Design a protein around this ligand. Structure first.
Ligand SMILES: O=P(O)(O)[C@H](F)[C@@H]1O[C@H](CO)[C@@H](O)[C@H](O)[C@H]1O
Ligand SMILES: [Mg+2]
Length: 215
């Protein structure tokens, strides 16, 4: 049986992927870049703050301006999330965490976000997590597998005996290359038809994770 579940945060635990999108789009338009629409944003889901900004820019600025722009977007995003609360936890997620703990299955965060710990606190979820993989500690971020490897290590479980939950293209690839089993949430048109994909997080039940692990 799998022995850990490795959670992305934005777009898996709560709807903060939407706020990242809105914040990056606002930033891009301030600098005259209008190509950050929902489709383009699929390239920013799961991707580090600096890599995200660079993807937008590739659509040159000084190093000083680059630093200011990343900070500006983060400052806006951090304002946007101040009122996040337990009511914002996505359907199924709180019960999944409870069921995993009752069944002695480890729970680790594998989020790119420096805002992850703040968000877990806002949602009263910190106590469910056996570990939070600090994204600033890994040499490489998504789609590199490092963060999922680190999350699994932090709870003493092999990636091959873990399930990873993700809403992003980059993150699904990261899970695949870690050895963990991905279950994506979102549209197959965005996330592919080669792994198990559910349309919303109500489908993330321990029963279903078992159903998938067995198949
Ligand atoms: O919250 P940040 O900026 O530290 C983190 F880098 C963000 O992580 C998201 C995935 O969890 C990305 O989608 C987002 O672009 C990025 O800024
Ligand atoms: Mg995500």
């Amino acid at each position: 049986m799998f022995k850990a579940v490795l959670f992305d945060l934005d777009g898996v635990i709560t709807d903060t992927a939407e706020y990242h999108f809105r914040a990056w789009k606002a930033l891009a338009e301030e600098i005259g870049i209008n190509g950050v629409d929902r489709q383009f944003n699929e390239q920013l889901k799961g991707v580090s703050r600096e890599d995200s900004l660079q993807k937008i820019l590739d659509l040159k600025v000084s190093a000083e301006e680059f630093k200011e722009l990343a900070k500006r977007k983060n400052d806006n995003y951090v304002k946007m999330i101040q009122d996040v609360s337990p009511a914002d936890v996505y359907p199924g997620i709180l019960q999944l965490l409870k069921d995993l703990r009752s069944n002695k299955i480890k729970i680790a965060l594998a989020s790119a976000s420096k805002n992850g710990p703040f968000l877990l606190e806002r949602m009263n979820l910190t106590g469910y997590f056996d570990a939070i993989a600090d994204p600033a500690e890994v040499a490489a971020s998504k789609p590199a597998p490092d963060i999922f490897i680190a999350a699994a290590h932090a709870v003493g479980v092999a990636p091959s005996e873990s399930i990873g939950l993700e809403d992003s293209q980059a993150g699904i690839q990261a899970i695949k290359d870690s050895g963990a089993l991905p279950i994506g949430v979102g549209r197959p048109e965005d996330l592919g038809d080669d792994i198990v994909i559910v349309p919303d997080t109500s489908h993330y039940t321990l029963e279903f994770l078992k159903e998938v692990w067995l198949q």
